[PDB]
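To the team - magnesium ion complex, inputs and output below.
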Amino acid sequence: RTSVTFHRPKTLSKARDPKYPRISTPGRNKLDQYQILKYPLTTESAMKKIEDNNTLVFIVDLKADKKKIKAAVKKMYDIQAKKVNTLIRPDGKKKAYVKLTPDYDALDVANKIGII
Amino acid sequence: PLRPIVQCQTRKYNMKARAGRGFTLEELKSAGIPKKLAPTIGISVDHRRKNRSLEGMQSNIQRLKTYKAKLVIFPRRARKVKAGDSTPEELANATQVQGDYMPI
Amino acid sequence: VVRIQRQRRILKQRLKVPPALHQFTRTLDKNLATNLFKMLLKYRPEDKAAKKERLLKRAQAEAEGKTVEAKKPIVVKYGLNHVTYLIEQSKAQLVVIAHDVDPIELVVWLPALCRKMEVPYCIVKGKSRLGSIVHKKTASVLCLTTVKNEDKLEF
Amino acid sequence: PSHKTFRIKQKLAKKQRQNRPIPYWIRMRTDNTIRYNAKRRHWRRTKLGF
Amino acid sequence: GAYKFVSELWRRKQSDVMRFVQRVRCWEYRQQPAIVRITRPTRPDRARRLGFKAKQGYVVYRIRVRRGGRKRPVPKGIVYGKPKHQGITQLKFQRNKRSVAEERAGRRLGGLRVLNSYWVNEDSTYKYFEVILVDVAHSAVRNDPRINWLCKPVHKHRELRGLTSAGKKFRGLRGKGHRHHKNRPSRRATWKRNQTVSLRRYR
Amino acid sequence: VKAGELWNKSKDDLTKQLAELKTELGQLRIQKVASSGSKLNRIHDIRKSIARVLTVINAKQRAQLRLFYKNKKYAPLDLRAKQTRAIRRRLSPDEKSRVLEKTKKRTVHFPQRKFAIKA
RNA sequence: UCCCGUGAACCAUCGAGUCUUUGAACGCAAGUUGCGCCCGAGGCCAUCCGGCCGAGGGCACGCCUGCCUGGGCGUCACGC
RNA sequence: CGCCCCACGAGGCGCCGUCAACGAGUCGGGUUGUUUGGGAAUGCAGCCCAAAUCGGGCGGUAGACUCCGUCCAAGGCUAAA
RNA sequence: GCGCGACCCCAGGUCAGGCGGGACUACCGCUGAGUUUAAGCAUAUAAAUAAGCGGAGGAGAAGAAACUUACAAGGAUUCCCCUAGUAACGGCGAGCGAACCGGGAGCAGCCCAGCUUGAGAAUCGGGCGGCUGUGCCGUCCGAAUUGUAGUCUGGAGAGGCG
Ligand SMILES: [Mg+2]
Ligand SMILES: [Mg+2]
Ligand SMILES: [Mg+2]
Ligand SMILES: [Mg+2]
Ligand SMILES: [Mg+2]
Ligand SMILES: [Mg+2]
Ligand SMILES: [Mg+2]
Ligand SMILES: [Mg+2]
Ligand SMILES: [Mg+2]
Ligand SMILES: [Mg+2]
Ligand SMILES: [Mg+2]
Ligand SMILES: [Mg+2]
Ligand SMILES: [Mg+2]
Ligand SMILES: [Mg+2]
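Output:
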């Protein structure tokens, strides 16, 4: 040996392959789109945002992030979000402002579900 | 199970007889009841007690024969009659005796 | 673990070893051990595999021939309690004690017992080697009770 | 403060949902004894202590 | 039949043969941690008589405990009390060092069950004990009729309740007659019984 | 929807009804949002319909899951018997019955015999 | 539609299920929904037959039985 | 109620006298502290000393000898009241 | 230029497992006061108690004499009555304080270590496969001779004969 210092020799670690699964039942996706998008908001402030800013206001799950909101609005309503802005409301629910890419029309999206 | 006659200890009571724990090995062997069979047929044993005086030993021997005389034993199976078993007539006349069947 | 073991042999060196424990440290030679271990290798006990077919074979001898006919197989004897028993009955003819038994008290008194009972005894080097003969990991003692009539001279 | 944690914001939200007078129809149920909300809180009179 | 010889030599503890073997072992023990797994009993014959078997699930550990008494652990040796309780430094713990060791193993080895223990060595500062522990989850234990009793729930932490051999010693249960009658069922059970005021219905 | 009419179906068909009952629930949230009056009380029906279908798929999947592993294979932690921690750690009746050779000879020879007196 | 029946119910009862975030609390923390790593069903292209977003799920500590990987003239045998 | 029939193994019992193994820093003693109704020291614990095998522990006053009664520690399990 | 075998240690998100925490009526272990009483107070008493630290079960603990007794002796443990406010202990003050005998409730005794397989580890775990599935069978690895099984536990027992 040249070094005076004895280090820990490195050995093999074998990976896990258990003889029975600790979980048989699969995972349901409990935050699916209907959990993510609960219901659109119909406050007069929101109805302004539809015309003036091409925007849609939803009440969303408290555990949904901006990315999943973008995905779920494409599966449901088959549209595109240019930008999603969120805030957790003073009473505990999360509100998402969805801006549609300028292809789609927010008013026509508003009509196809019924808000205006 | 059957208890033998013993004298009490201590001057104040040595003139009084009472039930003891169990028969000694000599009392069991003199009456011809094997050591490891007695608890199985209703007779307690005491590997600790001693026989220092002949009369006490004689008294407890007679109890074992008196008990053996009025003891009846059912077979271990239905029809096989091995040693120590009894006649069917005996086993129908048999009831659960209650109280002190051998008073002291 | 390395540090303590090296000092353990060094501290052993420095201290005065009393005679009973220094009666080891005088082992049988290499020349004689190769001679002795040649004999022991002849009398290895029956291997695990070497043991199940004969019991399979003696099934037929019992099931049809209705006789057991296998004759006395002759092999070395081992196990400390067994060898001590053979020694005190004087059925032992050669005792083979490993120098490196730990705890040593298991064998310290064997030299005295074999000397008092007048059986030849040797101290070979390596308990792991004795265990190899009998198909164990270590053995710590061996003894040959009886040799075949072909090896009286060599024995 | 304006700088708060999510955990404190969560508890403050629940405290607001609980400052409401009881529904009127509760007063009509069979074998009812609730008169008013006996736990109403006012920010200037009783502090939350959290 | 070799266990008789090894036991007799261990009786002769002032012989030079035993003084040398123990002196070197005491050196090494002092060089190891206070609670160490060991592969085989160093006193196999003393282990045999204490119920140890060479079976899977039996483990032996070596524990080191300190020697001496129990100084009162108070902030400066200051006692706020009557002069009868003001002593500090000649007081003695009521459990023997054997009991202290088996529970040190017991707490650390929370998954195993203490069976017995036995002295191996000592010097002026430490005493060394080897504790026989049992894996009551091992199937080679659960199928042994002689040791199944240790798997029942009523035997959890026997050493912490004073129920091993050392526990039976400092509890005064080695002995039977007068001179020991207050220790059975327990010293505190005896005290409670003698304290009771029995007010019968017709009195 | 009825419990019986779901237990007698195929896996994919159960998945459909979950999907569409889920869609009907999403639209009923919006009347509450906008309108009122009468269909506000289909939510409780639809909400329990989803739960009932979820129960059916789930209760079914364990019957298969147990069946596949009920070759007395190693069982998953979610399919093993949860009774109490104490019960699971007991000894088996066969283990509690292991007796020693000497003690069980004490029963082959010299069992406790049936006897009477006065004879 | 639930009324001579798969059948109401703030009904009783219990075997089938679900069971958010935590807590002995277990990936590291915590006046933080803060900070890592690993696996990975599913989908996209091809900068490979690889890489990209993944649904879900792991990664605490001590201990026992077995195993795999390895270390030290500690004791040997055999060599070179 | 039915079929299966227990053994050359083990056990009981009768004699024999040849053997007859039985738990160690443990017991035991001193000293210290605690505890007890336990009083020349009831149990327990520290430290020191440290066993025996015609031997060991007891017989509520410390001590030596002769006899006498008594039990066999230092490993473990065990219902019911 | 090696490959050995064992010893003692490693590191593994290795296969499979068991640990910790909670509740306080009663149970087991440790530690541990002072108020108070003594018409003051210090040993004593309060008390081997309260508080403190732990460990269990449905009961727990104890239990089969290295026991008592002094008798014509008895015979595991626990609980009740009695012994008994007694023998004893105690600034012999204040106070404190059991046990044996006897009578009841309930009764039950067991198993190891060691000389004692040596023609033969006859024992045990695990993977895998099968089936009658709380287990049994086959097979392959391993534990263990520094000792698994069987015998045996002083009441005995090994032998021998019948
Ligand atoms: Mg924001
Ligand atoms: Mg103010
Ligand atoms: Mg104080
Ligand atoms: Mg004292
Ligand atoms: Mg007990
Ligand atoms: Mg104390
Ligand atoms: Mg008071
Ligand atoms: Mg006063
Ligand atoms: Mg006063
Ligand atoms: Mg005063
Ligand atoms: Mg308390
Ligand atoms: Mg108990
Ligand atoms: Mg009176
Ligand atoms: Mg008192």
